[model samples]
Target: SDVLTVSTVNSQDQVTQKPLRDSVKQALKNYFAQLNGQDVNDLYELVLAEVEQPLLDMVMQYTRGNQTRAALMMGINRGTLRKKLKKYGMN
Candidate 1:
């Protein structure tokens, strides 16, 4: 079920160093395949919960816990980043 046959080329038509999207898509497909007729609810929230923590952690680490730079990298404001950090008990 590898429907996304197209390469995830960037705007400049160059490949990325990390193929995170493709890897996650394939992982979810494998998850569904293993479900064996079970119903999965709130898949969007499920994926977000799984992804957001690590994303915030890594971004924060990249900024050395500087909320302002982390927020900048995440395209969010510092306030929002602070809220998330508090929510995840990272701050």
Candidate 2:
């Protein structure tokens, strides 16, 4: 069995700036490890964006599709998440 992990770029997700890069890299690596036999070079940008998408999905679900609550839960400005949600075709 394998494990999947994710975290934000915020301080709560990381202790310091230096380790965040490597941590994100490791997170992606582990997530992709299960796709070992697939070719995904063309999906770089889309996949990166997918990270935020699912997180948004989760937050939205927890917040019952209330954007304001989700934004607050994520500690981001509601407007920013709204823009991101629209960018990802979430709503």
Candidate 3:
């Protein structure tokens, strides 16, 4: 089997740090292995709980932690965002 690997070369074709490559590989492996274990109905929930949380955290940070405004800017309902915040442990 082809193990997970991430190319960490720079734009100039230079090799990058091993830890960066290792972390990327691990996260990719985690994403596939963890997500693949879920049932059809559970997949979306799993992704949201795992993947969506980090993305939302970065988004909230970019918006200076203004989650209400972030929801509006992202075009999602505030109530749904609130639910996700709690579900993802951001609350």
Candidate 4:
């Protein structure tokens, strides 16, 4: 239950934040809570896909669709980035 604390000058300022890992942890916790003891399969792949799509989308948006810059920023090869984009139907 990690929270990001931010100081605001105005009382109406609505700023809420948390670390990425904390958000993921909470999401997974909710998932398990709702499952009611159901078995999970391919969890690694499921989580990877869930996380990767948004990551790619955000990075691509940040780089203005510049694949080279996105790849470098992600510390991944350009070809790998392209492959992942294609896999996500983004290419």
**lDDT of each structure?**
0.81, 0.77, 0.72, 0.87
Candidate 2 residue-wise lDDT, 1-91, digit = tens:
2244334466567632344456767767887897978876766786678568778998899999899989898899989998999998889
For 25-83, candidate 1 gives per-residue lDDT tens digits of 89899999999999998999888878889989888788887888888878988888788
C-alpha RMSD for every candidate: 7.4, 9.8, 8.2, 4.6
Worst 10 residues of 4 by lDDT: 1-10
Q: What is the TM-score of each candidate against the true structure?
A: 0.71, 0.52, 0.53, 0.79
**Weakest lDDT window of 10 consecutive positions for candidate 1:** 1-10
lDDT of 2: 0.77
TM-score-best of 2 and 4: 4
Kindly provide the TM-score of model 4 when superposed on the true structure, using C-alpha atoms: 0.79
lDDT of 3 by residue, 33-66 (tens): 8766564456556544666777688778888988
Residue 47 lDDT (model 1): 85
Off by over 4 Å in 2: 1-47
Provide the lDDT at 89 for model 1.
85
What's the lDDT of the predicted structure labeled candidate 1? 0.81
